[PDB]
Scaffold this motif. Structure first.
Motif, short mmCIF file in Angstrom:
data_model
loop_
_atom_site.label_atom_id
_atom_site.label_comp_id
_atom_site.label_asym_id
_atom_site.label_seq_id
_atom_site.Cartn_x
_atom_site.Cartn_y
_atom_site.Cartn_z
N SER A 145 0.86 -1.14 -0.10
CA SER A 145 -0.07 -0.10 0.23
C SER A 145 0.99 1.26 0.04
O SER A 145 2.02 1.23 0.69
N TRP A 146 0.67 2.34 -0.78
CA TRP A 146 1.37 3.47 -0.90
C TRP A 146 0.20 4.61 -0.84
O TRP A 146 -0.60 4.55 -1.59
N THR A 147 0.52 5.58 0.21
CA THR A 147 -0.52 6.57 0.35
C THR A 147 0.09 7.68 -0.10
O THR A 147 1.11 8.10 0.12
N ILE A 148 -0.34 8.40 -1.14
CA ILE A 148 -0.12 9.73 -1.70
C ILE A 148 -1.15 10.87 -1.07
O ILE A 148 -2.33 10.73 -0.92
N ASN A 149 -0.72 11.87 -1.19
CA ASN A 149 -1.42 13.13 -1.21
C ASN A 149 -1.66 14.01 -2.31
O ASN A 149 -0.65 14.30 -3.13
N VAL A 150 -2.89 14.31 -2.63
CA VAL A 150 -3.22 15.12 -3.88
C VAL A 150 -3.81 16.46 -3.38
O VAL A 150 -4.94 16.44 -2.46
N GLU A 151 -3.46 17.39 -3.88
CA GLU A 151 -3.72 18.84 -3.55
C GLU A 151 -5.18 19.11 -3.96
O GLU A 151 -5.97 18.56 -4.78
N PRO A 152 -6.02 19.71 -2.90
CA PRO A 152 -7.29 19.94 -3.31
C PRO A 152 -7.51 20.86 -4.53
O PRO A 152 -6.53 21.61 -4.73
N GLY A 153 -8.63 20.71 -5.18
CA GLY A 153 -8.87 21.82 -6.40
C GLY A 153 -8.17 20.65 -7.42
O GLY A 153 -8.37 21.13 -8.54
N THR A 154 -7.52 19.72 -7.58
CA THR A 154 -7.04 18.98 -8.50
C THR A 154 -8.08 18.44 -9.46
O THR A 154 -9.01 17.82 -9.12
N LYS A 155 -7.84 19.04 -10.67
CA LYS A 155 -8.94 18.79 -11.79
C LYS A 155 -8.20 17.86 -12.90
O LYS A 155 -7.44 18.04 -13.45
N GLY A 156 -9.07 16.59 -13.21
CA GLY A 156 -8.63 16.02 -14.10
C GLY A 156 -7.43 15.10 -13.78
O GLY A 156 -6.58 14.73 -14.57
N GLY A 157 -7.53 14.54 -12.48
CA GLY A 157 -6.29 13.68 -11.99
C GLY A 157 -6.59 12.35 -12.29
O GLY A 157 -8.00 11.85 -12.77
N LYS A 158 -5.75 11.44 -12.56
CA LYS A 158 -5.85 10.07 -12.84
C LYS A 158 -4.71 9.23 -12.20
O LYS A 158 -3.56 9.68 -11.80
N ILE A 159 -5.24 7.95 -11.56
CA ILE A 159 -4.11 7.13 -11.11
C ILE A 159 -4.35 5.65 -12.09
O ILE A 159 -5.63 5.59 -12.09
N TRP A 160 -3.31 5.13 -12.16
CA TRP A 160 -3.35 3.93 -13.08
C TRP A 160 -2.32 2.90 -12.38
O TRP A 160 -1.32 3.47 -11.88
N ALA A 161 -2.13 1.72 -12.94
CA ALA A 161 -1.24 0.76 -12.90
C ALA A 161 -0.37 0.61 -13.96
O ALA A 161 -0.89 0.68 -15.02
N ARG A 162 1.04 0.43 -13.88
CA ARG A 162 1.75 0.11 -15.04
C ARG A 162 2.34 -1.47 -14.86
O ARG A 162 2.68 -1.78 -13.56
N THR A 163 2.53 -2.22 -15.95
CA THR A 163 3.01 -3.70 -15.76
C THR A 163 4.30 -4.00 -16.48
O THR A 163 4.48 -3.14 -17.39
N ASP A 164 5.06 -5.09 -15.85
CA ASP A 164 6.34 -5.21 -16.71
C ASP A 164 7.37 -4.19 -16.79
O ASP A 164 7.63 -3.73 -18.19
N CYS A 165 7.67 -3.54 -15.73
CA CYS A 165 8.40 -2.13 -15.94
C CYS A 165 10.02 -2.41 -15.74
O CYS A 165 10.09 -3.56 -14.83
N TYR A 166 10.79 -1.78 -16.14
CA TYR A 166 12.26 -1.99 -15.87
C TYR A 166 12.76 -0.51 -15.54
O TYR A 166 12.35 0.32 -16.59
N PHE A 167 13.25 -0.05 -14.55
CA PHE A 167 13.76 1.27 -14.11
C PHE A 167 15.29 1.02 -13.97
O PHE A 167 15.75 0.31 -13.38
N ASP A 168 16.13 2.03 -14.38
CA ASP A 168 17.48 2.16 -13.84
C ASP A 168 17.61 2.88 -12.69
O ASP A 168 16.47 3.27 -12.14
N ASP A 169 18.75 3.02 -12.06
CA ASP A 169 18.98 3.77 -10.77
C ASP A 169 18.54 5.31 -10.92
O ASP A 169 18.36 5.95 -9.83
N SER A 170 18.53 6.05 -12.15
CA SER A 170 17.82 7.03 -12.09
C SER A 170 16.45 7.29 -12.33
O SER A 170 15.83 8.42 -12.30
N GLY A 171 15.62 6.34 -12.39
CA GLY A 171 14.07 6.11 -12.54
C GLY A 171 13.82 6.41 -14.13
O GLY A 171 12.77 6.81 -14.38
N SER A 172 14.40 5.83 -14.85
CA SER A 172 14.48 5.93 -16.43
C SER A 172 14.37 4.45 -16.92
O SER A 172 15.19 3.42 -16.57
#
Length: 207
Positions: free
Chosen positions: A36-63
């Motif tokens: 579980s990961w809890t985020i904070n989203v600013e009040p007034g956020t318009k057109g926000g979206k959350i989704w999952a991504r599958t089968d990812c590879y990231f290097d040490d810089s997050g790319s």
């Protein structure tokens, strides 16, 4: 507002949260099965979206890259992800109220429940096995079930003119998940919640 994002899938997902031109919170994070990961989203956020991504590879810089929902190769999403992506969508503090829905307009990758954790409204869910049942022509070789707009690029599927109707493809998402949008002009399945509600997005809520 807090969004607790919970991965109940048996596989790892990399959650993503964006309003299209900026990250929401850190914008993305790996969630192993059960985390579980809890985020904070600013009040007034318009057109926000959350989704999952599958089968990812990231290097040490997050790319790197994901097979579904990739947001410009970044771990921490600043922009929307590449279809197919089941979408939790929300606009918060819009004249006193919050509005939530799930949408299959950009296809489906992972089943999802999107529910308030506070009082005063109901959750929405699209948890049917849309990938396994996906029409042949919509199957994404990379994983997931594409929407017809992504696959065929017509005015009718993309609702480019503002005048489209349901289609054989939209009716497939709508049959499996009646409580999510299946095409741009679908009869709305948006839920009105109290302004400043908090929420939980649960991936694979039934398996």
């Amino acid at each position: 507002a807090t969004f607790e994002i919970v991965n109940r899938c048996s596989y790892t997902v990399w959650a993503a949260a964006s309003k299209g031109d900026a990250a929401l919170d850190a914008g993305g994070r790996q969630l192993n099965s059960g985390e579980s990961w809890t985020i904070n989203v600013e009040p007034g956020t318009k057109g926000g979206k959350i989704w999952a991504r599958t089968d990812c590879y990231f290097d040490d810089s997050g790319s790197g890259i994901c097979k579904t929902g990739d947001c410009g190769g970044l771990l921490r999403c600043k922009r929307f992800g590449r279809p197919p992506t089941t979408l939790a969508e929300f606009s918060l503090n819009q004249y006193g109220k919050d509005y939530i829905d799930i949408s299959n307009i950009k296809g489906f990758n992972v089943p999802m429940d999107f529910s308030p954790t506070t009082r005063g409204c109901r959750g929405v869910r699209c948890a049917a096995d849309i990938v396994g049942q996906c029409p042949a022509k919509l199957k994404a070789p990379g994983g997931g079930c594409n929407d017809a707009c992504t696959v065929f690029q017509t005015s009718e599927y993309c609702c480019t003119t503002g005048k489209c109707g349901p289609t054989e493809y939209s009716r497939f998402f709508k049959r499996l998940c009646p409580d999510a949008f299946s095409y741009v002009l679908d009869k709305p399945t948006t839920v009105t919640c109290p302004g400043s509600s908090n929420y939980r997005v649960t991936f694979c809520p039934t398996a």
